[PDB]
Design a protein around this ligand. Structure first.
Ligand SMILES: Cc1cc2nc3c(=O)[nH]c(=O)nc-3n(C[C@H](O)[C@H](O)[C@H](O)COP(=O)(O)O)c2cc1C
Ligand SMILES: Cc1cc(Nc2cc(F)c(C(F)(F)F)c(F)c2)n2nc(C(F)(F)F)nc2n1
Ligand SMILES: O=C(O)c1cc(=O)[nH]c(=O)[nH]1
Ligand code: NA
Ligand code: NA
Length: 353
């Protein structure tokens, strides 16, 4: 229940546990199915067909919650229309020293500097294999799986790390994600060409879509360059956005000046505006998964109207708990009807017209 979690459980956990420990508890409870199944039965208005797949609803769990593929089934039970795991790196790596995750409760925000802690591709591969046919059925039933691919800290050849990820986890995924960072266009083209070649080499029923995930912190020129390369190469979609290294004016949390990526409410509109720009630069031809500061149906609809076909959230779950998933869905449905839309699909990019 919505007020309970929001007003009692999540504030209690906030006071008892550091954020990373609270996250690990969440992963364990979700994976053990200890959480009651979601009440909200998805309506037809929420169904989206994009990336070669049906999505029963457009609200996904963003990368970073289930870094290692431990909680996929429990995430679907929570009501998410799709799950993205990762980021997964080729070799296991520990990530940064702890503490490396900080709450900014006053801002409805988090700052993290995990540093791509990962069990690595082989461990994750075996985890996914344990439920590969279960996932095939879930995907057919409108509940797809994405895999976000990272690179190891010490790697000398980033494109090869990504290529390894494609080869190892691509066969287990409906879509793959590669994160790109600003500080060039020829290097992005080269990387993505390699990734796409590896994807194209997989057998058809094991051949995923490939998306690029971007930061909110790109220059205008960087965005132009990404739009150009993604259209040229036929990248299947964009994930817009990762966390920000900016610190918007007005942050109140004591921990605002910690190094890392900022998520949650302070990111929201910077993300929506990035979606809007990318959608325009790509002429609406490139599906966008919109991410950053979604806590309500309004938040989701703003991203859809700006050009997102699907949305994800993470940070809101850490503040409001599982009920937030059904809240966003229910509010989105209500807003679509109020604004005269037949369904999600009809609202995609509606601001641009
Ligand atoms: C604790 C934490 C860890 C994250 N780890 C990853 C990651 O491994 N890979 C990735 O692509 N994005 C990662 N992200 C970014 C999220 O996927 C998402 O892009 C961002 O947090 C904005 O959404 P939100 O405001 O709903 O959290 C992480 C975010 C948080 C809060
Ligand atoms: C209070 C709190 C809660 C939490 N995640 C979380 C999220 C959850 F959904 C639950 C659940 F579902 F089990 F109830 C849970 F126990 C914990 N995180 N996750 C973080 C982190 F590290 F991801 F930022 N901080 C948190 N703080
Ligand atoms: O530090 C990480 O692992 C991580 C954090 C984040 O915000 N985004 C990401 O892509 N990785
Ligand atoms: Na299969
Ligand atoms: Na198979």
């Amino acid at each position: 229940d919505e007020r309970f979690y929001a007003e009692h459980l999540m504030p209690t956990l906030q006071g008892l546990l550091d954020p990373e420990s609270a996250h690990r508890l969440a992963v364990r409870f979700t994976s053990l199915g200890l959480l009651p199944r979601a009440r909200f039965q998805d309506s037809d208005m929420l169904e989206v067909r994009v990336l070669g797949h049906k999505f029963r609803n457009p609200v996904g769990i963003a990368a970073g919650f289930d870094k290692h593929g431990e909680a996929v089934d429990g995430l679907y039970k929570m009501g998410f229309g799709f799950v993205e795991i990762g980021s997964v790196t080729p070799k296991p790596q520990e990530g940064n020293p702890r503490p490396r995750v900080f709450r900014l409760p006053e801002d409805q925000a988090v700052i993290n500097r995990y540093g791509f802690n990962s069990h690595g591709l082989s461990v994750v591969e075996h985890r996914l294999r344990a439920r590969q046919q279960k996932q095939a059925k879930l995907t057919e039933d409108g509940l797809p799986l994405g895999v976000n691919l990272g690179k190891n800290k010490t790697s000398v050849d980033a494109a090869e790390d990504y290529a390894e990820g494609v080869r190892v986890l691509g066969p287990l995924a409906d879509y793959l994600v590669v994160n790109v960072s600003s500080p060039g266009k020829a290097e992005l083209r080269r990387l993505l060409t390699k990734v796409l070649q590896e994807r194209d080499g997989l057998r058809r029923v094991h051949r995923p879509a490939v998306l690029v995930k971007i930061a909110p912190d790109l220059t205008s020129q960087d965005k132009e360059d990404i739009a150009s390369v993604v259209k040229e190469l036929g990248i299947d979609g964009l994930i817009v956005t990762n966390t920000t290294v900016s610190r918007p004016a007005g942050l109140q949390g004591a921990l605002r000046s910690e190094t890392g990526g900022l998520s949650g409410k302070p990111l929201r509109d910077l993300s929506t505006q990035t979606i809007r720009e990318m959608y325009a630069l790509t002429q609406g031809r490139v599906p966008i998964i919109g991410v950053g500061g979604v806590s309500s149906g309004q938040d989701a609809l703003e991203k859809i109207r700006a050009g997102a076909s699907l949305v994800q959230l993470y940070t809101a779950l850490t503040f409001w708990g599982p009920p937030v998933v059904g809240k966003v869905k229910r509010e989105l449905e209500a807003l679509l009807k109020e604004q005269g839309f037949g369904g999600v699909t009809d609202a995609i990019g509606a601001d641009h017209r």
